[PDB]
Amino acid sequence: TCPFYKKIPGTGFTVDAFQYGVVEGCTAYFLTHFHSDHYAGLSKHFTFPVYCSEITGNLLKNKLHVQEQYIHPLPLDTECIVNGVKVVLLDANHCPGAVMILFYLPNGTVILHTGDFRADPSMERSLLADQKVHMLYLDTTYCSPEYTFPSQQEVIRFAINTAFEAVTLNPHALVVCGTYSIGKEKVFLAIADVLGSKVGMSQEKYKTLQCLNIPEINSLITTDMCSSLVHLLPMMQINFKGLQSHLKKCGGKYNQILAFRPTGWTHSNKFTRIADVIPQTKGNISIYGIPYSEHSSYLEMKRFVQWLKPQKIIPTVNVGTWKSRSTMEKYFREWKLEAGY
Ligand code: NI
């Protein structure tokens, strides 16, 4: 059964609620983004209206085979009427096609559902600036002050400078980047751009990337692995055994691997600066874990919420333990006392 924090009161709507069968009273199912924990349950046999971004709808049609007649893509930053209710989709600064959803309830209440997001000051000048928000359904993934990480721009600077140095020292080094979902494409695109290469990958991953409206993509990616010196592999293969095996397959073209695992946060964040990050090495294989996050840090989250000043917060992540829920509620009260709302 669908949990309460996936239901929008006063509407027929649910958010990211496709794994619960037919939800009683639901007339439209919203999907914030194409990540499996959120789409879990969709397929070609789904016959209710799904509302989403254009990019999300391209992925639904081509990857999950949802039929066209049931996909309802909406433009961003544009007031739309859904089953008698005004809605707006806003960029969530998460993965491609990810949105936040503003619902203007018939009784005057305004609700923001962040989906998954990485809060940014740029959001303070969207259509959120223009009215009061009563209830916030919040992505609380990193809601504790231990969760610090650098800007995406610092992490990409580190990756490009590391890759360019290695391959200029050794023109026979291969670069490998791990992936298992959409998101974090800047990692492998920025490294291939500094090296003058396309990114090589499996047909299934190429297909996924071609759904993303990324400009000039035909210029940046390929399925011809032999023509590329940046390869994409499943995240599970980014270990010494899987990388040794891959290097065998390249037929003596290369004699070294430099590999990247974009994680979110890891506890090596609480001690070390990005500048000081070092790889794990075994023979001619080195693996870097880089803290490229598509979720808010603690400080980014706190700034957003103190700017928005909601009347009520509903967490959507870390809700399964009493200790997590009590921690989050304590921070929400701090933020409200400090800011004065
Ligand atoms: Ni996500």
Side-chain angles (χ1 to χ4, degrees), residues 1-23 25-203 205-215 217-240 242-247 249-269 271-281 283-311 313-341:
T1 71
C2 183
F4 70 100
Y5 67 79
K6 296 185 176 273
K7 294 184 195 168
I8 307 298
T11 71
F13 304 150
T14 57
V15 179
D16 300 347
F18 301 91
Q19 63 168 295
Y20 303 107
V22 175
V23 178
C26 186
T27 58
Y29 294 72
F30 284 79
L31 182 60
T32 63
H33 68 293
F34 194 76
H35 282 165
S36 62
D37 278 354
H38 299 261
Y39 71 68
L42 276 159
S43 71
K44 69 166 76 174
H45 310 292
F46 202 82
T47 54
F48 294 94
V50 178
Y51 287 85
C52 58
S53 71
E54 178 189 350
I55 286 159
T56 299
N58 298 339
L59 293 160
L60 291 183
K61 180 189 162 165
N62 292 289
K63 304 287 298 193
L64 302 177
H65 311 295
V66 177
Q67 305 164 49
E68 201 134 63
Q69 71 178 122
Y70 303 112
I71 306 166
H72 300 254
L74 309 172
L76 303 189
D77 300 316
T78 300
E79 300 183 321
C80 298
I81 308 300
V82 174
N83 297 357
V85 182
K86 183 161 76 167
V87 310
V88 172
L89 300 189
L90 308 162
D91 204 276
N93 191 41
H94 184 52
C95 65
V99 304
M100 316 193 288
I101 310 162
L102 250 197
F103 298 99
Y104 294 79
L105 266 52
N107 74 358
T109 298
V110 178
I111 293 176
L112 177 61
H113 195 303
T114 69
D116 282 349
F117 85 142
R118 184 163 186 178
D120 194 77
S122 65
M123 298 171 174
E124 298 164 22
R125 294 166 283 283
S126 62
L127 311 191
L128 288 180
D130 304 46
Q131 79 295 281
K132 197 195 166 53
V133 172
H134 304 81
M135 313 185 71
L136 181 58
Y137 284 69
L138 180 61
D139 165 16
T140 45
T141 297
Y142 294 123
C143 190
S144 197
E146 76 269 25
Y147 300 114
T148 61
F149 31 70
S151 62
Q152 292 177 171
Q153 189 276 329
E154 296 170 74
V155 174
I156 290 299
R157 180 99 276 215
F158 175 86
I160 289 166
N161 287 358
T162 303
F164 182 78
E165 174 175 314
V167 173
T168 299
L169 288 173
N170 182 189
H172 301 272
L174 177 65
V175 178
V176 178
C177 294
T179 188
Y180 43 32
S181 56
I182 69 167
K184 308 189 184 183
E185 288 79 9
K186 190 68 175 173
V187 178
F188 53 83
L189 297 169
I191 287 166
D193 173 75
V194 81
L195 299 173
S197 179
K198 298 192 176 172
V199 186
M201 62 193 67
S202 70
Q203 299 180 250
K205 182 76 179 180
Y206 183 84
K207 179 182 186 183
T208 297
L209 297 183
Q210 287 289 162
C211 300
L212 311 178
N213 296 345
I214 287 168
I217 200 63
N218 295 334
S219 63
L220 327 161
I221 59 174
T222 186
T223 53
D224 179 3
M225 312 292 289
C226 297
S227 70
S228 163
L229 57 142
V230 180
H231 296 175
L232 302 188
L233 292 185
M235 199 74 86
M236 295 190 73
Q237 200 165 1
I238 311 301
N239 50 69
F240 294 123
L243 295 162
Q244 277 162 212
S245 179
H246 187 69
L247 190 56
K249 295 166 213 134
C250 296
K253 199 158 194 297
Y254 310 107
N255 64 4
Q256 179 185 348
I257 283 175
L258 179 105
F260 296 90
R261 291 183 348 78
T263 66
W265 174 93
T266 56
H267 194 53
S268 36
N269 273 281
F271 309 130
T272 311
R273 283 177 141 65
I274 183 64
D276 303 317
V277 163
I278 63 173
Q280 293 196 225
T281 294
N284 60 344
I285 304 184
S286 291
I287 305 173
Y288 283 87
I290 60 173
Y292 194 95
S293 183
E294 292 185 338
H295 296 273
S296 312
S297 73
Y298 176 82
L299 292 168
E300 290 161 355
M301 190 190 303
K302 177 177 183 278
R303 176 187 171 110
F304 181 77
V305 177
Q306 289 185 306
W307 168 84
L308 192 74
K309 301 181 169 59
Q311 299 180 350
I313 307 171
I314 299 164
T316 65
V317 187
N318 307 308
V319 301
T321 78
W322 301 114
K323 184 165 160 229
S324 286
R325 283 192 155 288
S326 173
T327 295
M328 292 181 297
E329 290 184 22
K330 287 176 32 262
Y331 291 126
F332 306 148
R333 184 58 64 188
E334 290 176 13
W335 300 352
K336 181 178 165 76
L337 291 168
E338 185 194 17
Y341 54 100

